[PDB]
């Protein structure tokens, strides 16, 4: 029974650098971030409403655990602790609204969707800007 469960590898990444600009990241780091983003792998274990997600590059890995509908702490795309909450939008799309623990900055959110043709699509939004990363089953 195919759901979000599996090992995914990035095949495209539109607007990553623009998003990091909105998050105040300096040019050079933006450019390295982009280079490193072509090696993004994602591992998802899913049972019902409940998700384990590991995202790794060449040199960094992180894990989140969440239940749909339950608040949890994570990091934004610019690595600040935030409050996060995930809701379904349809059978195989979910959206996440984030609010900052401490401090001021852009409105962030993200979405994961499992298309009919077997891709995983990730959007990440900072204010006006929308990054789109497409993944395929490893
Ligand atoms: C599930 C997930 C994956 C993902 C992909 C790319 C990311 C880039 C950065 C940066 C900088 C942070 C987190 C990423 C996470 C996700 O939910 O991301 C928000």
**CA 77 to centroid of ligand 1, rounded, Å:** 6
**CA 112 to centroid of ligand 1, rounded, Å:** 10
Q: What are phi and psi of 60, to 5 degrees?
A: -140, 145
- Name the residue ranges covered by the structural domains of the chain: 1-138
Taking CA atoms, 34 is separated from 18, 31, 64, 110, 117, in Å, by 10, 5, 22, 18, 26
Question: What residues pair up with 134 in beta bridges, in sequence order?
Answer: 12, 121
Cα separation, 28 vs 5, in Å, equals 35
Return the number of other C-beta atoms located less than 10 Å from residue 66's C-beta. Answer: 20
Method used experimentally: X-ray
DSSP state of 68: T
How is 14-57 classified by DSSP, letter by letter?
ESHHHHHHHTT--HHHHHHHHHHGGG-EEEEEEETTEEEEEEE-
Q: What residue ranges line ligand 1, CB within 6 angstroms?
A: 40, 42, 53, 55, 77, 110, 112, 122, 124, 133
């Amino acid at each position: 029974m195919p759901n979000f469960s599996g090992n995914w590898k990035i095949i495209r990444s539109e607007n990553f650098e623009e998003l990091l600009k909105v998050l105040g990241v300096n040019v050079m780091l933006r450019k390295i971030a982009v280079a490193a983003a072509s090696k993004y792998a994602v591992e998802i274990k899913q049972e019902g409403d409940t998700f384990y997600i590991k995202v790794s590059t060449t040199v960094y890995t992180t894990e989140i655990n969440f239940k749909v509908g339950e608040e949890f702490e994570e990091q934004t795309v610019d690595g600040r602790p935030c409050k996060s909450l995930v809701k379904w939008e349809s059978e195989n799309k979910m959206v996440c609204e984030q609010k900052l623990l401490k401090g001021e900055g852009p409105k962030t959110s993200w979405t994961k969707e499992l298309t009919n043709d077997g891709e995983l699509i990730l959007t990440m939004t900072a204010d006006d800007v929308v990054c789109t990363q497409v993944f395929v089953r490893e």
